[PDB]
Amino acid sequence: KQVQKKFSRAQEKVLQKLGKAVETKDERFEQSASNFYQQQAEGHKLYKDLKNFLSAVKVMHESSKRVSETLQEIYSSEWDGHEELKAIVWNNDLLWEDYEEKLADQAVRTMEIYVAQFSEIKERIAKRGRKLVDYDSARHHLEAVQNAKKKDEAKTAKAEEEFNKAQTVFEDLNQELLEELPILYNSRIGCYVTIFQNISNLRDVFYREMSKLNHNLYEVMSKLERQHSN
Amino acid sequence: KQVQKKFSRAQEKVLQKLGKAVETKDERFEQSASNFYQQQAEGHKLYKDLKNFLSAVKVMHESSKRVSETLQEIYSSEWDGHEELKAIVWNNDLLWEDYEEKLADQAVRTMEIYVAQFSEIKERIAKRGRKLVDYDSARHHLEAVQNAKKKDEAKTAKAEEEFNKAQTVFEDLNQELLEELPILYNSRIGCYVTIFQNISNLRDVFYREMSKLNHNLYEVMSKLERQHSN
């Protein structure tokens, strides 16, 4: 009977689009569903941006590694600062890798988890939609049975029970989503706070640690210059 | 007569390759020319690496801009910190642009100027090479004229003057390059010192200024969180 319900639903929907049947107005919930889709779209966009940010960090890392490798190739082992340069180059690579792993774990993964939560809510919104069409389909059938020339009390009674069942199942989903949607909508704030405080914390460590190695790099060049001074 | 000299040079070179004529040995200068080509190759490689580093910085900048633009789109103007966020996003973009312009000017351009200096020295090395082949060509001609059955005093005298002229012009170029090449070779040290002290100075400003905006970003999120706190 799950198959036949799907046929009566689709028939009700097409009769509504053809101006042959009236639908239950649902403009208030549609505004709520619109906010939900906007929130999910925003979330998906930030998620793709964060993956692109992580990919750009890896590009920055590799180009920095390329410069440091050529510098090590051209830096003679006869020169002062050669051993210190190796430590700078190794630790630079370690900071980039640590930063990439922590970005993936604290920012990209956190965003993936937030975005993945919308899937079950979207399925419930879709189900609520189907139950509302079931209700209008049950009203249309009830009105046709009641308006028939040949009165059939048993057909009337079945149409009336289907009406009642469709109202209750729709209202269960409607009550659940009207409670969940504003709480989910408000939770986007906490999501943005977490993501950007995590990025901020990780970059502060990154700047402080990179500044130390960067200062050592200047000192390596000072040692090289002094060794060859007249 | 500049055309005929080029023919006698190429004829001398091919007779040497065919084991039919002896060349002046020039193994010591060849070792010096090898050091010069290695230095130029190293310089060109670092130069391409620095252009790639600047291109990676622009990639990092754009991805950072992409994240900041989405954050500004999703950050309601109803929220505390909205105006401060705009200033962070604008100043972040300004720091990246300033860093890219200074890298191009202080590191990439400095390296371009160093690499461009090798062109005139390479032309002088090539010329010295040609003058050495002119000298061996003048020796081969002199020996053939002197070994002839029919003694020709006027042909002998011309071959002897060509010998003298070829020796002097070769030695002028040889003296010039033996003086220039070790000084140029030693100057690679000063080049590396300048490039990496410039990169170091620019990144220190970059880290300090970015750390300030990055700290403000955490504070924007704290303001957003407090506004929506229970």
Q: What is the DSSP annotation of B82-144?
A: HHHHHHHHHHHHHHHHHHHHHHIIIIIHHHHHHHHTHHHHHHHHHHHHHHHHHHHHHHHHHHH
C-alpha separations of B194 from A90, B76, B105, B117 in Å: 22, 47, 13, 16
Q: How far is A96 from chain B (nearest CA, A)?
A: 13
Interface contact A59-B57, CB threshold 8 A: no
C-alpha separations of A43 from B65, B67, B80, B199 in Å: 17, 12, 20, 37
Of A46, A60, A70, the CB nearest to B56: A60
Residue B58 near residue B100 (C-beta atoms within 8 A): yes
Interface test with B, best of A64, A211, A222, A229 (most B CBs within 10 A): A211
CA gap A55, B133 in Å, rounded:
56
- Window 29-68 of A, Cβ < 8 Å to B: 42, 45-46, 49-50, 52-53, 55-57, 59-60, 62-64, 66-67
Using what technique was this structure determined?
Answer: X-ray
What is the three-state SS of chain A?
CHHHHHHHHHHHHHHHHCCCCCCCCCHHHHHHHHHHHHHHHHHHHHHHHHHHHHHHHHHHHHHHHHHHHHHHHHCCCCCCCHHHHHHHHHHHHHHHHHHHHHHHHHHHHHHHHHHHCHHHHHHHHHHHHHHHHHHHHHHHHHHHHHCCCCCCHHHHHHHHHHHHHHHHHHHHHHHHHHHHHHHHHHHHHHHHHHHHHHHHHHHHHHHHHHHHHHHHHHHHHHHHHHHCCC
SS3 label, residue B62: helix
| Beta-carbon count within 10 A of B23 CB | 16
A129: left (phi over 0), alpha (psi -120 to 50) or beta: alpha
- Chain B residues touching A38 at Cβ < 8 A: none
Residue B200 near residue A214 (C-beta atoms within 8 A): yes
With CA atoms as reference, the chain A residue closest to B53 would be A63
Interface contact A63-B73, CB threshold 8 A: no
Interface contact B210-A220, CB threshold 8 A: no
Nearest to B207 by CA among B95, B102, B131, B126: B95
- The domain of A118 spans 1-230
With CA atoms as reference, the chain B residue closest to A208 would be B207
Interface contact A45-B192, CB threshold 8 A: no
CA gap B84, B213 in Å, rounded:
10
Interface contact B63-A56, CB threshold 8 A: yes
Interface contact A225-B75, CB threshold 8 A: no
Of B66, B193, B221, the CB nearest to A193: B221
Interface contact A196-B217, CB threshold 8 A: yes
CA gap A31, A186 in Å, rounded:
15
Number of domains chain B is built from: 1
- Chain A residues touching B62 at Cβ < 8 A: 56
SS3 label, residue B207: helix
Touching check for A228 and chain B: CB below 8 Å? yes
Q: What is the CATH number of the domain that holds B6?
A: 1.20.1270.60
> Nearest 5°: CA angle at A32, between A31 and A38?
90
Of B53, B63, B189, the CB nearest to A52: B63
Touching check for A202 and chain B: CB below 8 Å? no
Residue A161 near residue A140 (C-beta atoms within 8 A): no
Touching check for B74 and chain A: CB below 8 Å? yes
